[PDB]
Ligand binder design. Structure first.
Ligand code: MG
Ligand code: MG
Ligand code: MG
Ligand code: MG
Ligand code: MG
Ligand code: MG
Ligand code: MG
Ligand code: MG
Ligand code: MG
Ligand code: MG
Ligand code: MG
Ligand code: MG
Ligand code: MG
Ligand code: MG
Ligand code: MG
Ligand code: MG
Ligand code: MG
Ligand code: MG
Ligand code: MG
Lengths: 49, 229, 251, 116
RNA sequence: CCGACUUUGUGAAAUGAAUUUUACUUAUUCCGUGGGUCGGAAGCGGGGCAUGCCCCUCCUUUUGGCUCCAAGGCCCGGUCUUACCGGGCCGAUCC
RNA sequence: ACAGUCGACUC
RNA sequence: ACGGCCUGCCAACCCUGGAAACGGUUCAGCCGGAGGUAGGGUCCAGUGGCCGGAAGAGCACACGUCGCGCGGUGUCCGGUGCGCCCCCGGCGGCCCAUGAAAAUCCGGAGGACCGAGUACCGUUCACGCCCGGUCGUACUCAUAACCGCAUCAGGUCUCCAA
RNA sequence: UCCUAAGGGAAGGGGUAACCCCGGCAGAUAGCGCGAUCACGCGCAUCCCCGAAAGGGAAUCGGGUUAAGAUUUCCCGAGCC
């Protein structure tokens, strides 16, 4: 009884990235981890001289 | 123009997902393919005896093409080309009551007919397909040819022989007679063939084929003798 | 006479392993290009209890080397792995606990677990709770290695065989007395129907060689030959000695 | 090749083109309307059903189903069924309750066939 | 349990006039995959103290993130004939 | 830390 | 039943702030510089409240009518609990015992591909239309409908429980 | 009815004198699928069926009614998939 033609979409979803699958505290940490490690990729390339 | 950029993908051992390259080596083939490839592998590994190793020693490319020019000249009669020969003698049989036809000259074929001819010495040249399966049908030919003193060659392709006579497989051909306008150009290929096979029989009957190991095994061998030096 | 309890086990009718709540085989990754010539990072997601086995099992989520999906592999837990740990799999992975390396990358004296025997058989030695193998020496002219196994047996293994660094977790599990027929029964319920065990001396001759007699006694030598036919090879199979072990006899 | 697995190639097949039909005769409709409505049951129970619920109660073929029962009650009687219920009597025959749309009157239909 | 014959082939040595030792890989047995990178040779870097000519490496150690269906360059061809689709190679070393 | 209203029970 | 609005337990989450003279809290735990108390909030459960369904139904009365007539009234107010049954919540505990799988459903990561504004591309929105097949359906479920040669003091799994 | 559990039958194959016995043994595997048909492209990975009226599970409640059906099967009202 989650079927699309039995619940309203606003009642089935949460309006964020990864919502309905990941909570806020988890998605926040994924954002931070992805950003920080992306930064370390290029600081490591710059260390490659 | 400015927006366009390079995005190099690093195809490391833990990097990007590699793309569609050639994996034809590692394909898992049907069992039919698998056994037929392992067939040639095993025929290479094992020591082929001289009788079978006389094969894989075929008539050259130039000599084979030159001989097949003449075999194409002397093709047999088609079916549509065989109906007319019997349909147009109708006037000669119904009215003339005479037979005016002459002897045509064609290449002979079929294992039994050619063996009868060779044993009666009415064969001027014998053409053996190298790739006959089962091989015992043509293993004994070279000795018969050599010791009845008949010029014989082992050309490549039983299908290509079969095309000469319009059958799917032929496995043997022979010329018994040639038109008087092509004797010289026949006897040139006769000289080449007789020099190539009928004289070298008495030394290839001692040569063992096979025993060539795999590429990897040969690589380790080449590694081994260098260290031995 | 009739078929013995020890013969009856070969059919599986009531003697098969109770394998309904087990979590699948516990084994390494498929040996491939990456794991042979480099390293692969896997993240340990959860350490689950596998029913019927003494050791915890570590679910590890690799990324598939050549197609776009994950790989949930399931390793035998080496003491120390915790969720979120990155375990490295391959040849040039550094030597740390939880990593899996070939024996060409593990120095003498290293303690390892879940050892392969034929390179790629996915780990067979030193898997029970709290067991490890000590890598003793390496012969690089053969590409082979030697190891001391939990039994004390010393085995020569190919040097390209993988091995998890560390020892299997759950160590010392068998140190605790169970104190109860209850605990024994719940131990063996999730393993197999091999408990309780009835002393053959308290059977009748028709079903066991030891049975029968006005008194309870074996009757003949309790040690049987190696070649004794099944249904007679019961007791102490091909014993080299008996009696409580003293001195070098227990070495 | 790219994938290291070999799959059976997509061949082409033909649909059947028989040189002679394995059956010549066209199969006759053996579940026609007359085999599918054997006769209206006329016990007092169905009699009361006629007026109290505006339904005709028939004995119908055991291989009939609600779809064919409506389709048949339409071709006979020049009526239509709003709803149909079927049960299998203990005696073996199937009994069907056919409830009419209120445009049609069950008493008039049952008098035009003769039950009461 | 072990012995012989058989599938059971190849060449090599040492002992006697067959015997143990070996070597090979294709028979054979076994193991692993969704037969997904095997063998040789290149090249990118690192060791030079006969510039050797032999070695060591393959662009992921990092924090429970994400990675697919190529960006990029070059060479043809079709076309509005003054406006645009299909090709081939490199990227992804060869054999 | 007082006043008002109520309270089913247990010792 | 169902629909809307409201309420928002016990937990979970958010924002402000910054705690030792440590505080908060449970029957028991336990929680806090990884952010407590405190202030304000979000979410969740519901078998909770109001309205619609729905008083036109049901019931109890009270009359008066020949013949499934009819008419009239009521269907309110609190409170209680170591109470019984059912379900749920969230704690805590035991395990050499960790206590099924799939169908199905939903959510998300990515964004190849696509469109108008005298109009064309979508729309998991509201409303609207049509159809819903086959088989079981009675009764006992037992000191008489089952088995024990029976209308046998025997045996046979359950739900409700003043 | 649908899905799986323990388990059971099975196509290719292996065994068998033959009935019959083995299902992972890997075989161009039973089935191919999806976007497109104005056709083609891409994928194919642990690859079949059966197995529960106590497991999982699209949807229904109230009031009437029979000599015997229905609480939710008929009638009345209101819903749902
Ligand atoms: Mg929402
Ligand atoms: Mg037992
Ligand atoms: Mg014991
Ligand atoms: Mg005992
Ligand atoms: Mg006794
Ligand atoms: Mg005995
Ligand atoms: Mg005894
Ligand atoms: Mg029915
Ligand atoms: Mg608060
Ligand atoms: Mg509610
Ligand atoms: Mg708990
Ligand atoms: Mg019924
Ligand atoms: Mg009933
Ligand atoms: Mg009885
Ligand atoms: Mg009886
Ligand atoms: Mg089923
Ligand atoms: Mg069921
Ligand atoms: Mg059920
Ligand atoms: Mg109705």
């Amino acid at each position: 009884e989650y079927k699309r033609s039995r619940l309203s979409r606003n009642r089935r979803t949460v309006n964020r990235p990864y919502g309905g699958v990941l909570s806020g505290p988890a998605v926040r940490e994924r954002i931070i981890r992805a950003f920080l490690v992306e930064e370390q990729k290029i600081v490591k390339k710059v260390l490659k001289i | 123009n400015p927006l366009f950029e390079k995005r190099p993908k690093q195809f490391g051992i833990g990097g990007a997902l590699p793309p569609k390259k050639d994996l034809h080596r590692f394909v898992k083939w049907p069992k039919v393919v698998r056994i037929q490839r392992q067939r040639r592998i095993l025929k290479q590994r094992l020591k082929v005896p001289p009788a079978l190793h006389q094969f894989t020693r075929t008539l050259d490319k130039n000599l084979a093409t030159n001989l097949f020019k003449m075999l194409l000249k002397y093709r047999p009669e088609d079916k549509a080309a065989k109906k007319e020969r019997l349909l147009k003698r109708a006037q000669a049989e119904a009215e003339g009551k005479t037979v005016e036809a002459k002897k045509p000259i064609v290449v002979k074929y079929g294992l039994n007919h050619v063996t009868y001819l060779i044993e009666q010495s009415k064969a001027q040249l014998v053409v053996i397909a190298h790739d006959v399966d089962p091989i015992e049908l043509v293993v004994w030919l070279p000795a018969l040819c050599r010791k009845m003193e008949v010029p014989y060659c082992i050309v490549k392709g039983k299908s290509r022989l079969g095309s000469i006579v319009h059958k799917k497989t032929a496995s043997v051909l022979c010329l018994t007679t040639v038109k008087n306008e092509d004797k010289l150009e026949f006897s040139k290929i006769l000289e080449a063939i007789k020099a190539n096979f009928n004289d070298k029989f008495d030394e290839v009957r001692k040569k063992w084929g096979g025993g060539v190991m795999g590429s990897k095994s040969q690589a380790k061998t080449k590694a081994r003798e260098r260290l031995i030096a | 006479g009739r078929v013995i309890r020890a013969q009856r086990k070969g059919a599986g009718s009531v003697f098969k392993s109770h394998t309904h709540h087990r979590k699948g085989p516990a084994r390494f990754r498929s040996l491939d290009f990456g794991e042979r010539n480099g390293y692969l990072k896997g993240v340990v997601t959860d350490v689950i209890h596998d029913p019927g086995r003494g050791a915890p099992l570590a679910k590890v989520t690799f990324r598939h080397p050549f197609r776009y999906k994950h790989q949930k592999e399931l390793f035998v837990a080496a003491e120390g792995m915790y969720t979120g740990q990155f375990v490295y799999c391959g040849r040039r992975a550094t030597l740390s606990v939880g990593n899996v390396l070939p024996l060409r990358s593990v120095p003498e004296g290293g303690v390892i677990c879940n050892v392969e025997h034929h390179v790629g058989d996915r780990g067979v030695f030193a898997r029970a709770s709290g067991d490890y193998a000590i890598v003793i020496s390496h012969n690089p002219d053969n590409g082979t290695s030697r190891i001391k196994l939990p039994s004390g047996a010393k085995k020569i293994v190919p040097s390209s065989c993988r091995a998890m660094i560390g020892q299997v977790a759950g160590g010392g599990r068998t140190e605790k007395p169970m104190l109860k027929a209850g605990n024994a029964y719940h131990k063996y319920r999730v393993k197999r129907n091999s408990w309780p065990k009835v002393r053959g001396v308290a059977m009748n001759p028709v079903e066991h060689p030891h049975g029968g007699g006005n008194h309870q006694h074996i009757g003949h030598a309790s040690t049987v030959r190696r070649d004794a036919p099944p249904g007679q090879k019961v007791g102490l199979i091909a014993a080299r000695r008996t009696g409580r072990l003293r001195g070098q006899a227990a070495a | 090749r790219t994938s290291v697995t070999f799959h059976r190639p997509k061949t082409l097949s033909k649909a059947r083109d028989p040189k002679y039909p394995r059956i010549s005769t066209p199969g006759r409709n053996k579940l026609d309307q007359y085999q599918i409505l054997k006769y209206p049951l006329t016990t007092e129970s169905a009699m009361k059903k006629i007026e109290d619920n505006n339904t005709l109660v028939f004995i119908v073929d055991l291989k009939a189903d609600k779809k064919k029962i409506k389709a048949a009650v339409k071709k006979m009687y020049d009526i239509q069924a709003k709803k149909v219920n079927t049960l299998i009597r203990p005696d073996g025959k199937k009994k069907a309750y056919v409830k009419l749309t209120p445009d049609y009157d069950a008493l008039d239909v049952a008098n035009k066939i003769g039950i009461i």
